[PDB]
Design a protein around this nucleic acid. Structure first.
Ligand code: FAD
Length: 456
DNA sequence: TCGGCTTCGCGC
DNA sequence: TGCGCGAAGCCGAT
């Protein structure tokens, strides 16, 4: 649909129909940003072709009640900065509240929309909203992959088993899809308050907060400043200060050598393609550049491939055949320890390293990547059943992680607990053939003592 | 029908 | 600290 620096493989028609005479509505959801947004840039191209304005809509769902203050305040503060950014380009933003299956369908008919466009997300709750809006509208409905560099439906046509089967497929399409972004043109035709949704949003989640003994809450919101502008600063500080020694200090949680980009990448406050653009042009360690590109391109986009082609990505059914047979054969094995969800949540286990990992999760909202594997694997070893292990790990992840409720989370937890995108290993107690990670293995990799004392 | 796929453990 | 190095399945160029 028109344009030259616009790859049509990023667009796919979700429903046919006659193009209305009204404005193009962009149902933004996953990629909350003004710049470097294919879904917003595509909506402008269709809007410019029909001589209609482009409008952005956002439907705040009732699923923030399963997500606390740390994820609500991080999202809402970025939406307030986004509203000012879109207003500078004369693009109005409308913020709705309720079921998107009924609010979006009511919004298009009331505003007399001509074409509806939205971003891509492989989550189950998004596929239900889409089908509910297709049966309630009469205008064409388009969908853009603005999160992945290579469109999810174009990178692979099936669920990829491991990373070595997905790496040559992704890198073969890189010269075509890795491109610069055109500047968002402003509107030529101008035609709820967020401060109130934030006040009414926190007061409902105040009782469900994580507090210490003296009613002192555990979350430290000064570690990550939300917003599109702040997300660019974290990227700039990563390339100049942390990219050189990233390839060597990536498995050391005592060194702040990660990009710290996942909270902005999950909420779409920064484009992963823009990060790859700047990383590919920077002169750093070739081992560190290949190590970082392999995380934000291969592992990040294979998680979308895992959730898009496996509807039960958060269940035991999505595990490989060799894993399910191994975990079922070790269901009657005697567990050395058994902890409930409340014991895992408060970090009241016998392992000081695991408790230190959980304390970093509760206090900073972003637990180190290497400790996240030790964190989720110890849950499987100290639980009643593999089904309970998956339930506790997903619950604690999507509640305190700033990057929670993300395909990277479900695919990461499935990698540690169900061996997805991995292979079998030494046969062991309880965990069977799933890869085991011990306290002593982390002691030789990094100063474990420094990690415990930092988080009690 | 082999090949070498990490974010492993553990011994120089 | 790098470097080996067993121990286990299923994919993919054949
Ligand atoms: C049990 C478990 C749970 C996780 N929970 C989440 C989660 O809820 N949300 C989330 O976005 N990621 C999660 N991760 C992936 C990974 O832990 C985080 O991406 C990473 O820790 C975030 O910090 P970073 O961006 O500074 O890491 P970096 O080394 O700087 O990587 C940058 C980006 O690459 C991506 N990435 C890196 N590693 C992975 C990976 N193993 N899988 C998928 N993407 C990756 C991330 O998007 C990340 O933002 C989880 C992994 C595991 C094993």
């Amino acid at each position: 649909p028109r344009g030259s620096h616009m790859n049509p493989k990023r667009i796919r028609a979700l429903k046919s129909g006659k193009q209305g005479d009204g404005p193009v509505v962009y149902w933004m959801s996953r990629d909350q940003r003004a710049e470097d947004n294919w879904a917003l840039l595509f909506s402008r191209a269709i809007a410019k072709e029909a001589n209609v304005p482009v409008v952005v809509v956002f439907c705040l769902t009732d699923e923030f009640l399963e997500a606390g203050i740390r994820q609500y305040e991080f999202m809402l503060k970025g939406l307030q900065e986004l509203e000012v950014s879109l207003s500078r380009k004369k693009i109005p933003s409308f913020f709705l509240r309720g079921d998107p299956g009924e609010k979006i369908s009511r919004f298009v008919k009331d505003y007399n929309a001509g074409t509806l466009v939205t971003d891509f997300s492989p989550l189950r709750i998004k596929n239900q909203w889409i089908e509910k809006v297709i049966s309630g509208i009469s205008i064409p409905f388009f969908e853009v992959d603005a999160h992945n560099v290579v469109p999810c439906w174009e990178a692979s046509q099936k669920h990829e088993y491991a990373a070595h089967t997905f790496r040559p497929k992704l890198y073969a399409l890189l010269p075509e899809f890795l491109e610069e972004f055109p500047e968002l043109e402003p509107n030529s035709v101008t035609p709820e308050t967020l401060s109130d949704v934030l006040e009414t949003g926190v007061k409902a989640l105040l009782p469900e907060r994580a507090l210490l003994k003296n009613k002192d809450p555990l979350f430290e919101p000064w570690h990550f400043e939300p917003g599109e502008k702040a997300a660019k600063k974290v990227m700039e500080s990563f390339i100049a200060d942390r990219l050189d020694s990233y390839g060597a200090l990536r498995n050391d949680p005592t060194k702040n050598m990660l990009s710290n980009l996942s909270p902005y990448l999950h909420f779409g406050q920064i484009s992963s393609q823009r990060v790859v653009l700047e990383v590919e042009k920077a002169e750093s360690n070739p081992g560190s550049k290949k190590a970082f590109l392999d995380e934000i391109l291969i592992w990040k986009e294979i998680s979308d491939n895992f959730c898009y082609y496996n509807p039960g990505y958060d269940g035991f059914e999505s595990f490989p055949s060799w894993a399910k047979e191994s975990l079922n054969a070790h269901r009657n094995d005697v567990r050395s320890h058994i902890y409930t969800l409340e014991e895992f949540e408060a970090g009241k286990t016998h392992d000081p390293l695991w408790n230190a990992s959980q304390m970093e999760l509760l206090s900073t909202g972003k637990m180190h990547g290497y400790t996240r594997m030790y964190w989720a694997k110890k849950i499987l070893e100290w639980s009643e059943s593999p089904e309970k292990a998956l339930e506790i790990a997903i619950c604690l992840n999507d509640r305190y992680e700033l990057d929670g409720r993300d395909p990277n989370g479900y695919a990461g937890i499935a990698w540690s607990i169900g061996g997805v995108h991995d292979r079998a290993w030494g046969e062991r107690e309880v965990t069977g053939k799933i890869r085991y990670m011990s306290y002593e293995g982390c002691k030789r990799k990094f100063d474990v003592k420094l990690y415990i004392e930092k988080y009690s």
